Design a protein around this motif. Structure first.
Motif, PDB file in Angstrom:
ATOM      1  N   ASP A 184       0.858  -1.206   0.000  1.00  0.00           N
ATOM      2  CA  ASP A 184       0.000   0.000   0.000  1.00  0.00           C
ATOM      3  C   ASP A 184       0.893   1.255   0.000  1.00  0.00           C
ATOM      4  O   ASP A 184       2.124   1.144  -0.104  1.00  0.00           O
ATOM      5  CB  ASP A 184      -1.020  -0.020   1.164  1.00  0.00           C
ATOM      6  CG  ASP A 184      -0.366  -0.024   2.538  1.00  0.00           C
ATOM      7  OD1 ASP A 184       0.560   0.773   2.784  1.00  0.00           O
ATOM      8  OD2 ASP A 184      -0.786  -0.835   3.394  1.00  0.00           O
ATOM      9  N   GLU A 185       0.282   2.438   0.093  1.00  0.00           N
ATOM     10  CA  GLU A 185       1.006   3.730   0.007  1.00  0.00           C
ATOM     11  C   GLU A 185       2.225   3.867   0.935  1.00  0.00           C
ATOM     12  O   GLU A 185       3.204   4.509   0.566  1.00  0.00           O
ATOM     13  CB  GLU A 185       0.038   4.939   0.197  1.00  0.00           C
ATOM     14  CG  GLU A 185      -0.536   5.164   1.614  1.00  0.00           C
ATOM     15  CD  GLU A 185      -1.796   4.338   1.960  1.00  0.00           C
ATOM     16  OE1 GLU A 185      -2.250   3.517   1.127  1.00  0.00           O
ATOM     17  OE2 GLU A 185      -2.349   4.503   3.081  1.00  0.00           O
ATOM     18  N   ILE A 241       8.881   7.738  -2.191  1.00  0.00           N
ATOM     19  CA  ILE A 241       8.313   9.027  -2.629  1.00  0.00           C
ATOM     20  C   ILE A 241       9.298   9.742  -3.548  1.00  0.00           C
ATOM     21  O   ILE A 241       8.903  10.209  -4.611  1.00  0.00           O
ATOM     22  CB  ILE A 241       7.842   9.933  -1.444  1.00  0.00           C
ATOM     23  CG1 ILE A 241       6.782   9.222  -0.578  1.00  0.00           C
ATOM     24  CG2 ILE A 241       7.301  11.280  -1.952  1.00  0.00           C
ATOM     25  CD1 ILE A 241       5.526   8.775  -1.306  1.00  0.00           C
ATOM     26  N   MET A 284       0.956   8.964  -2.549  1.00  0.00           N
ATOM     27  CA  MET A 284       1.424   8.186  -3.740  1.00  0.00           C
ATOM     28  C   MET A 284       0.887   8.768  -5.056  1.00  0.00           C
ATOM     29  O   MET A 284      -0.301   9.101  -5.163  1.00  0.00           O
ATOM     30  CB  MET A 284       1.023   6.711  -3.605  1.00  0.00           C
ATOM     31  CG  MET A 284       1.613   5.799  -4.673  1.00  0.00           C
ATOM     32  SD  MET A 284       1.889   4.111  -4.090  1.00  0.00           S
ATOM     33  CE  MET A 284       0.227   3.456  -3.875  1.00  0.00           C
ATOM     34  N   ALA A 339       6.753   8.902  -7.452  1.00  0.00           N
ATOM     35  CA  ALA A 339       6.321   8.344  -6.168  1.00  0.00           C
ATOM     36  C   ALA A 339       5.430   7.114  -6.349  1.00  0.00           C
ATOM     37  O   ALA A 339       4.219   7.227  -6.607  1.00  0.00           O
ATOM     38  CB  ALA A 339       5.587   9.391  -5.349  1.00  0.00           C
ATOM     39  N   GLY A 340       6.020   5.938  -6.187  1.00  0.00           N
ATOM     40  CA  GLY A 340       5.278   4.676  -6.301  1.00  0.00           C
ATOM     41  C   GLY A 340       6.096   3.572  -5.656  1.00  0.00           C
ATOM     42  O   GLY A 340       7.104   3.846  -4.997  1.00  0.00           O
ATOM     43  N   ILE A 341       5.691   2.336  -5.881  1.00  0.00           N
ATOM     44  CA  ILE A 341       6.354   1.163  -5.286  1.00  0.00           C
ATOM     45  C   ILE A 341       7.284   0.575  -6.358  1.00  0.00           C
ATOM     46  O   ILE A 341       6.832   0.279  -7.475  1.00  0.00           O
ATOM     47  CB  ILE A 341       5.307   0.139  -4.850  1.00  0.00           C
ATOM     48  CG1 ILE A 341       4.267   0.810  -3.935  1.00  0.00           C
ATOM     49  CG2 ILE A 341       5.963  -1.044  -4.145  1.00  0.00           C
ATOM     50  CD1 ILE A 341       3.132  -0.102  -3.551  1.00  0.00           C
ATOM     51  N   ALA A 379       5.714   2.933  -0.678  1.00  0.00           N
ATOM     52  CA  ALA A 379       6.228   3.711  -1.804  1.00  0.00           C
ATOM     53  C   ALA A 379       7.536   4.386  -1.489  1.00  0.00           C
ATOM     54  O   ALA A 379       7.869   4.630  -0.337  1.00  0.00           O
ATOM     55  CB  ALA A 379       5.229   4.759  -2.250  1.00  0.00           C
ATOM     56  N   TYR A 426       1.788   2.214  -9.078  1.00  0.00           N
ATOM     57  CA  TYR A 426       1.162   3.267  -8.287  1.00  0.00           C
ATOM     58  C   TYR A 426      -0.045   2.779  -7.484  1.00  0.00           C
ATOM     59  O   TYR A 426      -0.709   3.573  -6.836  1.00  0.00           O
ATOM     60  CB  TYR A 426       0.797   4.418  -9.218  1.00  0.00           C
ATOM     61  CG  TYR A 426       2.049   4.916  -9.932  1.00  0.00           C
ATOM     62  CD1 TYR A 426       2.952   5.743  -9.287  1.00  0.00           C
ATOM     63  CD2 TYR A 426       2.368   4.475 -11.206  1.00  0.00           C
ATOM     64  CE1 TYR A 426       4.127   6.159  -9.908  1.00  0.00           C
ATOM     65  CE2 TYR A 426       3.533   4.888 -11.849  1.00  0.00           C
ATOM     66  CZ  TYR A 426       4.408   5.726 -11.198  1.00  0.00           C
ATOM     67  OH  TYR A 426       5.574   6.118 -11.831  1.00  0.00           O
ATOM     68  N   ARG A 427      -0.318   1.478  -7.528  1.00  0.00           N
ATOM     69  CA  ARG A 427      -1.400   0.864  -6.783  1.00  0.00           C
ATOM     70  C   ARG A 427      -0.827  -0.386  -6.147  1.00  0.00           C
ATOM     71  O   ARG A 427      -0.279  -1.224  -6.854  1.00  0.00           O
ATOM     72  CB  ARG A 427      -2.517   0.446  -7.735  1.00  0.00           C
ATOM     73  CG  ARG A 427      -3.276   1.592  -8.372  1.00  0.00           C
ATOM     74  CD  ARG A 427      -4.336   2.156  -7.454  1.00  0.00           C
ATOM     75  NE  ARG A 427      -5.363   1.155  -7.163  1.00  0.00           N
ATOM     76  CZ  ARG A 427      -6.428   0.868  -7.915  1.00  0.00           C
ATOM     77  NH1 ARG A 427      -6.689   1.517  -9.049  1.00  0.00           N
ATOM     78  NH2 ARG A 427      -7.258  -0.091  -7.505  1.00  0.00           N
TER      79      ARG A 427
END
Ligand SMILES: C[C@]1(c2ccc(-c3nc4ccccc4c(=O)[nH]3)cc2)CNC(=O)N1
Ligand SMILES: C[C@]1(c2ccc(-c3nc4ccccc4c(=O)[nH]3)cc2)CNC(=O)N1
Ligand SMILES: [Zn+2]
Ligand SMILES: [Zn+2]
Lengths: 209, 208
Positions: free
Chosen positions: A94-95, A100, A163, A106-108, A98, A190-191
């Motif tokens: 989840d966020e 940043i 995110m 900014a994502g995983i 990430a 991003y999800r």
């Protein structure tokens, strides 16, 4: 709802995950500053991560992305290193997971090179290294990485000189090193629902002889 | 040379060994895959393991370790689960009883949690479960564990989630670093550093 199942070293599945780990070690431009100095790992354990709810969350998103991308999930197996691996296997991505300030937004972030993900096991830049010795190149303390199922969908290709939301009409970013031709790609989603932490790998880095 | 002496359930010695067995059960991260699903045991029998030669082999080694560690053997009572418990009680621990692929190297592994040793009764990962029903969670078949006297000496502390001991050490301690409820596990590299004092026969119990 997570259970962990040990794989036997005599199992083809274990062997295949180990070979993906070992075969994707490369040299890093920091000379080992972040992840340590090593050419190979000592693999101590490989576990399958089983969570029905997280699995259903993943397959539902994969189906949405697949239909949006004309029946193509563009699913990969990719490495993820993080100081929050224990939270990820229990609660899912989840966020909070990430990066940043990552170079592709900014994502995983995930890696084809296991040694790239090894640089994040103790935090961004390797943080201060292992808890016990404060050594980013510690050969004693046990490390953990995830080998994850990741849905890329339509991926935006970004060349990099090494995110948030995705680029419009894209479900991920592909960060492709253009200078170091031995560096493999890095990927950003991003999800959190677009990744499932399928294997938990426990290991040491090995001192070159 | 081995004889087995049955302890009465009224004996304080039976009662103290049963309490260590029951009180050290925990939940495992495999959800019971290797060892079965249970919160407690049905203890069927506890026997003292008596072998003069094996005992003297143990105490000889304990004195050597003690003399290398400021007169401190660092002796613990720990559980051991294995398919080879019958060989162990008759011939002693040796290199054939080691876990070659264990997280802390090829040595003989012991647990504070009885439920951790229970995962090894039918082999690594619980093997294929009981011989009769092929069930890792069998509630019918009789299982055996050893409660052993173990000399740790100077123990190497490994934080974490047959070979030799690390130089200058007589054992390794696997300290748990993730699961806040897990107790420690231990590895010795010489069979003479453990004596199989009690043989415990039991069933795992199905939760209500
Ligand atoms: C959650 C965390 C973080 C940052 C980066 C990574 C990470 N970044 C990467 C960047 C490129 C390739 C792989 C990775 C990878 O495997 N992991 C993981 C976690 C840790 N602290 C933070 O602010 N973000
Ligand atoms: C002899 C054997 C073996 C392996 C592991 C164990 C074992 N491993 C443990 C690991 C951690 C904690 C306790 C134990 C424990 O009580 N027993 C016992 C026997 C069985 N097969 C094998 O190759 N090695
Ligand atoms: Zn360390
Ligand atoms: Zn059975």
């Amino acid at each position: 709802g997570t259970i962990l199942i040990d794989l036997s070293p005599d199992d083809k599945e274990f062997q295949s995950v180990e070979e993906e780990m070992q075969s994707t070690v490369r040299e890093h431009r920091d000379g080992g500053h972040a992840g340590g100095i090593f050419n190979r790992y000592n693999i101590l354990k490989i576990q399958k991560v089983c969570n029905k709810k997280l699995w259903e969350r993943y397959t539902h998103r994969r189906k949405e992305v697949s239909e949006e991308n004309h029946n193509h999930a563009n699913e990969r197996m990719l490495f993820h290193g993080s100081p929050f691996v224990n939270a990820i296997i229990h609660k899912g991505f989840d966020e909070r997971h990430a990066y940043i300030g990552g170079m592709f937004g900014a994502g995983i972030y995930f890696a084809e090179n296991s040694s790239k993900s090894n640089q994040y096991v103790y935090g961004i830049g390797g943080g201060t290294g292992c808890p016990v010795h404060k050594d980013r190149s510690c050969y004693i303390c046990h490390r953990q990485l995830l080998f994850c199922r990741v849905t890329l969908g339509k991926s935006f290709l970004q060349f990099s000189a090494m995110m948030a939301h995705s680029p419009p009409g894209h479900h991920s970013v592909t960060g492709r090193p253009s200078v170091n031709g031995l560096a493999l790609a890095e990927y950003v989603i991003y999800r959190g629902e677009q990744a499932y932490p399928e294997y938990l790998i426990t290991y040491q880095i090995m001192r070159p002889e």
